[PDB]
Amino acid sequence: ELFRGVLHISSNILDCANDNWWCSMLDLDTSDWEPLTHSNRLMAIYLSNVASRLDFTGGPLAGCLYFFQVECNKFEEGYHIHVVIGGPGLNARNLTVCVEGLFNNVLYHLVNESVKLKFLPGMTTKYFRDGEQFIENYLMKKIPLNVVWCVTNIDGYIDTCISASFRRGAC
Numbered sequence: 648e649l650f651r652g653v654l655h656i657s658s659n660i661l662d663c664a665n666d667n668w669w670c671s672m673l674d675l676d677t678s679d680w681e682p683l684t685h686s687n688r689l690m691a692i693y694l695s696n697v698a699s700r701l702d703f704t705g706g707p708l709a710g711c712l713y714f715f716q717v718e719c720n721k722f723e724e725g726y727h728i729h730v731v732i733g734g735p736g737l738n739a740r741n742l743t744v745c746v747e748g749l750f751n752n753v754l755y756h757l758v759n760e761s762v763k764l765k766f767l768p769g770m771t772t773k774y775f776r777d778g779e780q781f782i783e784n785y786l787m788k789k790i791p792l793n794v795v796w797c798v799t800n801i802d803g804y805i806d807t808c809i810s811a812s813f814r815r816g817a818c
């Protein structure tokens with residue numbers, strides 16, 4: 648059972664990038680993707696950093712399954728990361744605080760200014776618990792560069808997630 652939520656990243660945050668963010672030496676398997684523009688790569692770096700820090704985290708985030716997808720905002724500048732996550736120790740009472748701590752320690756290493764991300768959970772007018780079906784019915788049916796990047800540790804999606812052709816098949 649996997650939770651669902653969104654974090655918005657305004658374009659002003661990209662302006663504050665320091666040398667640890669820009670000079671990342673990551674390889675990024677784009678064998679089945681579109682050429683990722685510089686800022687697209689900055690967001691791919693950020694997403695890989697957050698997944699990396701999450702894979703060996705402790706506390707409530709240890710042993711959790713995650714699926715993060717960063718996309719460009721449809722009508723404005725900026726990006727938004729669709730966050731689907733669930734794991735032992737993870738409940739509705741700590742989801743927001745855990746996600747904000749995780750994402751901000753990574754962002755802090757890569758920025759010159761004091762920034763904070765606000766997590767917005769899927770909820771009716773009760774936290775949503777359809778994350779696996781949210782991944783299947785919506786997040787995975789986007790084709791780049793509508794979706795900019797994606798990271799996951801869920802068996803099955805570990806590779807079928809950064810493959811443009813597989814995303815193009817559901818279309």
Ligand SMILES: [Mg+2]
Binds near residue numbers: 718727729
């Ligand atoms: Mg979206």
